[PDB]
Design a protein around this ligand. Structure first.
Ligand code: HEM
Ligand code: HEM
Ligand SMILES: O=C1O[C@H]([C@@H](O)CO)C(O)=C1O
Ligand SMILES: O=C1O[C@H]([C@@H](O)CO)C(O)=C1O
Ligand SMILES: [K+]
Ligand SMILES: [K+]
Lengths: 248, 248
């Protein structure tokens, strides 16, 4: 239920130019997964009951980067600082979410609609709102549902974001890619999740929780059979996540 | 601006009986300062922008007792558990605030009006909202003013709560009483604050901040000259603090 704010023509021109520069930079640096993870951890702190947190640029604060769930995301902030400085008119909030949208696009994923106008806010949210990889469906619903206000369909679709990238034992402690093609955005996360553990590939307990839940599991089966349907629901869910607490 | 909830006659009878039992117990155990500090740290987590936190019984949770600002308050919770069990109808929130009101009364202080009907809530607030003793007036206003929504007069009056009790090097790290009579509720905190450091008595940086601020300092002078005026403003401020986020 969104009402997007008006931004000047110069702001809109800067979005379009930054989008292109982000494509080139993210593709060349091979950091699309990290950038997706930065945008998601930015937005995923939203609490709908208090309207605190969410995608309002606070993740660049050292206080929020120190959160253990954000281990490694200081690399992302640093990687983007030279480009952000070329687009001073843009908020950090818009810039990081635009980077997440581009991360998905440049790895072959759906084109997530983007609307500008997030304002940078000065206080990071409390630590502890991001999901815990060792937990299961109840915990997923607590975080995405009770806090962020996303649907069970969004949970499954957004979990397929793991179709790009890898864990790092020096960041979370988990290690390895979810897929055999970690810079390619496709439905492979779901086909691997269904096939069992393969050697070399990662499954978190929070991934496996999707297989045993009666609402999540049919979605997993849908996305593994129908990549177009995964792309549609993913684009819906990403857009919602990127706009949590914004333009309501 | 309060609208107090209706409670049954049995609840009201239990308040009155617990008030008496609290007087006897707190007087005998010599723990009025700790009990005041428990009630204040319960209520002082209130944030008026989000309506989170405040005096709703969450301080008995191990998660909130672990907060470093609450070092030692597990002693208080434990001390009160046998009495609370004699009054099962009462919420923990009402019981702890009633204990704070009695702590003030039984050490000779003003009779703070008490209204029942706080409901126990299940989530403790985030850590870090209670004031920092090494900081000054700006920090006091951030905490009491911007979060809790109390006035500068309340800040000074409520700081005179230090007229009873002591710091402990194994809890905060500070050590000693503010006053020569730490179980007597009087204006002595302000007369000591004005006289300078005396040997054996404690002044926190947050106490000393009251002397250098142009709004706080006249209040300090008022309370040190006029204990009746301290008692009046204290009773006002304590009642407000004990009712933050309650019955609005
Ligand atoms: C469902 C609950 C989730 C849990 C428990 C979880 C947990 C994790 C963990 C532990 C890592 C490894 C971090 C590291 O060690 O480098 C990770 C990586 C990643 N996460 Fe999630 N995550 C969840 C949901 C999401 C969502 C909703 C998105 C985006 C839509 C996402 C995108 C990513 C990406 C792209 C990576 C790889 C990052 C890289 O390669 O640097 N995750 N996640
Ligand atoms: C103004 C900002 C405040 C700061 C920075 C502060 C800080 C502290 C500290 C560090 C201690 C010592 C804890 C220990 O080591 O045992 C303490 C004790 C105490 N505080 Fe405060 N406090 C403040 C306000 C308040 C308020 C508003 C009240 C109640 C109205 C209060 C009541 C007490 C009492 C009664 C004690 C003594 C506790 C005991 O003897 O066990 N304080 N405070
Ligand atoms: O997605 C990522 O990009 C870098 C690296 O893989 C390529 O630069 C990294 O640290 C990430 O987790
Ligand atoms: O106010 C207090 O009561 C006890 C003790 O002084 C008397 O029991 C203590 O640990 C407190 O800080
Ligand atoms: K993939
Ligand atoms: K005293």
């Amino acid at each position: 239920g969104k009402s997007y704010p008006t931004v000047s023509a110069d702001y809109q021109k800067a979005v379009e130019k930054a989008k292109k520069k982000l494509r080139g930079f993210i593709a060349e640096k091979r950091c699309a997964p990290l950038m997706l993870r930065l945008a998601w951890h930015s937005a995923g702190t939203f609490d709908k009951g208090t309207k605190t947190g969410g995608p309002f640029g606070t993740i660049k604060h050292p206080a929020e980067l120190a959160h253990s769930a954000n281990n490694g995301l200081d690399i992302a902030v640093r990687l983007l600082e030279p480009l952000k400085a070329e687009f001073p008119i843009l908020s950090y909030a818009d810039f990081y979410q635009l980077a997440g949208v581009v991360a998905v696009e440049v790895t072959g994923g759906p084109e997530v609609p983007f609307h500008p106008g997030r304002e940078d806010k000065p206080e990071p949210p409390p630590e502890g709102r991001l999901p815990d990889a060792t937990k299961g469906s109840d915990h997923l619903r607590d975080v995405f549902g009770k806090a962020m206000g996303l649907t069970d369909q969004d949970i499954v679709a957004l979990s397929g974001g793991h179709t790009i990238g890898a864990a790092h034992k020096e960041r979370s402690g988990f290690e390895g890619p979810w897929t055999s093609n970690p810079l390619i955005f496709d439905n492979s996360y779901f086909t691997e999740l269904l096939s069992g553990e393969k050697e070399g590939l990662l499954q978190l307990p929070s991934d496996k929780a999707l297989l045993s839940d009666p609402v999540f599991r049919p979605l997993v089966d849908k996305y593994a059979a129908d990549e177009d349907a995964f792309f549609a629901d993913y684009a819906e869910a990403h857009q919602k996540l990127s706009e949590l607490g914004f333009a309501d």
